[PDB]
Amino acid sequence: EHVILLNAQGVPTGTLEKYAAHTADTRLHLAFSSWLFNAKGQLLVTRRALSKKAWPGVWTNSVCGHPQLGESNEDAVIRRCRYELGVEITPPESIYPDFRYRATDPSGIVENEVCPVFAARTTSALQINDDEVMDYQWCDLADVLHGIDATPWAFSPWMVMQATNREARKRLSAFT
Amino acid sequence: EHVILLNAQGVPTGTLEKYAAHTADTRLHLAFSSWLFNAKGQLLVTRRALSKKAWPGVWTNSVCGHPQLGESNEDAVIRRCRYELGVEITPPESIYPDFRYRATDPSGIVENEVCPVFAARTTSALQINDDEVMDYQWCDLADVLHGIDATPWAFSPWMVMQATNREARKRLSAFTQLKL
Ligand SMILES: [Mg+2]
Ligand SMILES: [Mg+2]
Ligand SMILES: [Mn+2]
Ligand SMILES: [Mn+2]
């Protein structure tokens, strides 16, 4: 797998192997973030495996990943949902198209991404890939927002940023 | 380093090497838990390092540890605060002396402990020890308590059990006063 390097204006300029790409000096690249809800409207929150290079063991929104060259964001979401969670989903919907962020994890590993945000509903049972996900919780979106608002440090920095953007929170609040 | 083994009634029967002790079938042993507040009354919350054998990478209260032979529970608090956090403290106050818990961690390691709970003030700057703590935050107690209420699964189970104990929570609240 790779990541897609982006210039200032967001234009793809080349690629890097994905593992090699995330370092203390990560360069800007393309990503996505997804928030998954089940048919009952519960939010899936996941805990990243301790083997992930960036933010291992961190609670976060359902699924993130890295679109490959010429892959649509919707297809990347679908792909990683299958890969990380063995789950089938409805067509992903746009909830925060212009999200972009840079952050450094506790060991000094940086994410630096153009990271459009989506939401979808699961249409099958999860089947967990424990190389990616070490724990998960189905919960009310309302409670998750309360926890994000009270102890943001207990969640990934991008999950906090996405959830605290007015429009994004508005749009996630509707999948319930 | 060892742990002090306890029987049925809470009576020590011997010691066991610490690493060897914590397994899928951990025996009952002595521990402690401490909640630390700075002068301003903020609570120190910490994130266990990824290398901890039990609940690695989990957010929790300030410091937990295991009294050793000849050591009082309070001196163990003092020692671990220095070892894990580099920090000096005021005399630890007993806020939940009867706390006991058993729990299995995400990879199946069991903790099975008599774990009196304390609170104290820090009196020096932190010098975090990265072999034990990977992250930390100074917070308002109320915020932490709201977080635990909302998403209890995001924290260590013992942190949540202690914080929702009415008596222990009242003492935690007393430590939020600003103290020069
Ligand atoms: Mg991912
Ligand atoms: Mg400890
Ligand atoms: Mn990335
Ligand atoms: Mn123990």
From Swiss-Prot, chain A:
Associated pathway: Isoprenoid biosynthesis; dimethylallyl diphosphate biosynthesis; dimethylallyl diphosphate from isopentenyl diphosphate: step 1/1
Entry's Gene Ontology BP terms: dimethylallyl diphosphate biosynthetic process; DNA damage response; isoprenoid biosynthetic process
Protein's UniProt keywords contain ATP-binding: no
Recorded catalytic activity of this chain's protein: isopentenyl diphosphate = dimethylallyl diphosphate
Essential cofactor(s): Mg(2+); Mn(2+)
Location of the protein in the cell: Cytoplasm
PROSITE patterns: NUDIX (PS51462)
Binding positions for substrate per the UniProt entry: K18, R48, K52, H66, R80, E84
Keyword vocabulary terms for this entry: Cytoplasm, Isomerase, Isoprene biosynthesis, Magnesium, Manganese, Metal-binding
Active site per database record: C64, E113
Cofactor binding annotation: Binds 1 Mg(2+) ion per subunit. The magnesium ion binds only when substrate is bound.
Domain called Nudix hydrolase: residue spans: 27-161
Primary localization: cytoplasm
GO molecular function, one term: zinc ion binding
Matching SUPFAM superfamilies: Nudix (SSF55811)
Residues binding Mn(2+): H22, H29, H66, E111, E113
Similarity comment: family membership: Belongs to the IPP isomerase type 1 family.
Complex formation: Homodimer.
Official protein name in the record: Isopentenyl-diphosphate Delta-isomerase
Organism of derivation: Escherichia coli (strain K12)
